[PDB]
Structure formats: structure tokens, C-alpha cells
Design an enzyme around this catalytic site. Structure first.
Site, mmCIF file in Angstrom:
data_model
loop_
_atom_site.group_PDB
_atom_site.id
_atom_site.type_symbol
_atom_site.label_atom_id
_atom_site.label_comp_id
_atom_site.label_asym_id
_atom_site.label_seq_id
_atom_site.Cartn_x
_atom_site.Cartn_y
_atom_site.Cartn_z
ATOM 1 C CG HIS A 156 15.168 31.305 59.274
ATOM 2 N ND1 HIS A 156 14.810 31.649 58.008
ATOM 3 C CD2 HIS A 156 15.971 32.297 59.717
ATOM 4 C CE1 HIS A 156 15.374 32.816 57.705
ATOM 5 N NE2 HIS A 156 16.083 33.240 58.708
ATOM 6 C CB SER B 171 17.902 36.674 59.080
ATOM 7 O OG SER B 171 18.577 35.954 58.030
ATOM 8 C CG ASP C 255 11.266 31.836 57.625
ATOM 9 O OD1 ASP C 255 11.537 32.007 58.833
ATOM 10 O OD2 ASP C 255 11.958 32.331 56.704
#
EC number: 3.4.21.5
Lengths: 65, 259, 36
Positions: free
Chosen positions: B43, B205, B99
Site C-alpha cells: 500500500h 506504515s 500487503d
């Protein structure tokens, strides 16, 4: 991704009904004054994003372009 | 990292930074395993909804970095990527299932006191190590809060931060969220009345979530910082890609000259 | 076969490598020894 509060009605992928993401195919209907948020079904536009930061020191010229 | 603490230098040799090459801004974190490889969360590269698809051409890796903003001439190393591998089945149109993505250095970088590769678990030190209650570690230069509240505790750290978290048990992960949970993800945070607290956040992230081994003395990369249903949110927890459960696809893309 | 699975994996040149522990590190092994 980190998901946060929906700021506008219509908004798609946001923290709508409490701390619960309103997935795609859903629309966060922002409750007005003292009324509750309602992630109803319908297509709706996702929140904004693709962030983080504002003052990055100059890196060796060619790396960037 | 929400309510962590400034990291010591060398506290995280393998903590890389995905840098959007201009616009000047920190896009994410990643880990560094080979000396020419990088591991991030999908992502960060391809996130269709945020009009996210990036190129070798759009982002730089920096390794052995401490300051978020300072360019560290003697310390860090900027590398131009070559490849961008995403997981054959990375599911953004749901839960951010598997992911994961491998980046590739347009050269083998040279290790330093500031650069060291991180380990990838083994059925020995994964099975023995993934027992809920066990504190993991997260590092990142993301926000110290969630700012859609007009954020005081100006959410950007100026140095890399660290919080240690316990691993929580499946049953309790699913009860947190409405989102479907996969095998390919473990959650980690404090039960809501533990006193201690902490969570990852925006721009943390696809960053490290490591666990050290007592058996051998290594830092292992258990998961990747995948998604959050509000950082450090109460009675809420953080999801991490499961690396062990994918250690296998990874394999098949490193070789690949192999088979 | 770019590797990634190095032999000198996750041995911190400053911490372990030097024999030196890290600030909060006990915390993690305090997790494992109160158990589960």
C-alpha cells in the site's frame, strides 16, 4: 493505512460509526448537531491523503529531478 | 509511533525510509534484509484508492537515518531502487490482505554501524516466538497523534521513535474491528486497561515490527505495519502483515533466476 | 538470488556486536519470562 475520522458526508473509507472504518460501497453521512454518524450504503468518495512532512533538507542534487 | 520515545543511534540499523523523490516528504518506513533488498508494505507503493501507484522513478530509500528531516551526509545512504515487486495477491479492496512488497537496490549498499540487515523468522523462531503477551518493537517517523482534531502534540517526531508492544490474541483482534481479519496479519497492542499504551500511526506504515530472540541473539522481522483503525485508539489495536506466512512468496522473487 | 537472508542478520554492530544492550530491550525479554 491508518484510518481516521470522516470530515465530510459522502466520504468513503473513513472512521464513521464510532472508530469503525466505513468501507467502499458505503457513504459516511455526517450527523449534524447532536445527531449520529451513519455509514449508509451507496458509493461515496474516499477521504484525501498521501502525506507526511514539510521541511526536508536539500539532498544531493541528482538523486532527485 | 504514538507514545513511544526517541530511538538511540544504531537502535535500528535496518530501519529504512521510503522517500517520495519530490515532493519533498516521507512516504513510509521499510526494513532492510539483503544489502540490495528492501521490504515494505504494499500500500505504500500501490494504494489505488489514494491514487497511489509509484515508480522506481518516484521514490528514494535512505538507510541508517535518525533525524526525520536532517540530511545526514556522513551517516545515511540514499539509494535509487531498481525493481518493485508487490504481492501477486495484495488486496486493498478489503483488508489490506498480504500487503507486502520487495524493493531492489540499484547496487548492493555497504553496511555500517548505522546499516545492518534484519532477520526473517524460521519455524523455530516464529513458532517459539509468536505467543500472545510477548512484546514486539515498532520504529517510525510518523505522527505522535491523529491530527484531524487539529493536532496539538504536533504529531511529527524530529527523530526516529520506538514503542514495544505485546502480541494480542486472534480472538480479541476480530472483536476490535468490523473488517475481516486474515491469517496474513496478527494484531498487537495493550488491552484497554493495561495502563501502558502505545501504537503506530500515520507514516509509520510498512515499518518494522521486530522481536529479539533469547535463543540466538537476533532481531527478527515478524510483521509489517499494515493498517490502523485509528492509532492508539482505545480498545483498538494495530494490524501487522504476517511475514512468516509469506516468507515463502519472498523466497520465490529473490531467486527468480532460480526455481 | 540477491540473498536478503544474510548470516550476519540482525546483529547490531553497536548493541549486540559490541556486547552492549539497548535501553528498553529487557522489556522484551521480560515479556517472554512472565510468560505465555
Amino acid at each position: 493505512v491508518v484510518y481516521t475520522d470522516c470530515t465530510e458526508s459522502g466520504q468513503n473509507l473513513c472512521l464513521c460509526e464510532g472508530s469503525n472504518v466505513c468501507g467502499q460501497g458505503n457513504k459516511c453521512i455526517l450527523g449534524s448537531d447532536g445527531e449520529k454518524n451513519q455509514c449508509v450504503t451507496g458509493e461515496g468518495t474516499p477521504k484525501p491523503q498521501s502525506h507526511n512532512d514539510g521541511d526536508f533538507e536539500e539532498i544531493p542534487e541528482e538523486y532527485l529531478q | 509511533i504514538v507514545e513511544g520515545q526517541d530511538a538511540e543511534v544504531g537502535l535500528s540499523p535496518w530501519q529504512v525510509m521510503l522517500f517520495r523523490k519530490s515532493p519533498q516528504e516521507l512516504l513510509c518506513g521499510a526494513s532492510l534484509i539483503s544489502d540490495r533488498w528492501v521490504l515494505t508494505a504494499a500500500h505504500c507503493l500501490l494504494y489505488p484508492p489514494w491514487d497511489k501507484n509509484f515508480t522506481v522513478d518516484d521514490l528514494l530509500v535512505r538507510i541508517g537515518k535518525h533525524s526525520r528531516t536532517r540530511y545526514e551526509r556522513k551517516v545515511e545512504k540514499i539509494s535509487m531502487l531498481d525493481k518493485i515487486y508487490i504481492h501477486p495477491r495484495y488486496n486493498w479492496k478489503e483488508n489490506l490482505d498480504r500487503d507486502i512488497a520487495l524493493l531492489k537496490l540499484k547496487r548492493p549498499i555497504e553496511l555500517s554501524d548505522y546499516i545492518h540487515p534484519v532477520c526473517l523468522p524460521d519455524k523455530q523462531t516464529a513458532a517459539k516466538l509468536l505467543h500472545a503477551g510477548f512484546k514486539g518493537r515498532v520504529t517510525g517517523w510518523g505522527n505522535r497523534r491523529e491530527t484531524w482534531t487539529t493536532s496539538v502534540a504536533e504529531v511529527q517526531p524530529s527523530v526516529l521513535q520506538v514503542v514495544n508492544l505485546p502480541l494480542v490474541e486472534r480472538p480479541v483482534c476480530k472483536a476490535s474491528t468490523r473488517i475481516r481479519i486474515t491469517d496474513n496479519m496478527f494484531c498487537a497492542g495493550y488491552k484497554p486497561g493495561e495502563g501502558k499504551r502505545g501504537d503506530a500511526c500515520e507514516g509509520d506504515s510498512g515499518g518494522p515490527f521486530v522481536m529479539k530472540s533469547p535463543y540466538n541473539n537476533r532481531w527478527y522481522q515478524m510483521g509489517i505495519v499494515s493498517w490502523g483503525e485509528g492509532c492508539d485508539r482505545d480498545g483498538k489495536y494495530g494490524f501487522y502483515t504476517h511475514v512468516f506466512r509469506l516468507k515463502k512468496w519472498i523466497q520465490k522473487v529473490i531467486d527468480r533466476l532460480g526455481s | 538470488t540477491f540473498g536478503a537472508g544474510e548470516a550476519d542478520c540482525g546483529l547490531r554492530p553497536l548493541f549486540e556486536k559490541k556486547q552492549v544492550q539497548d535501553q528498553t530491550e529487557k522489556e522484551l525479554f521480560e515479556s517472554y519470562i512472565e510468560g505465555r
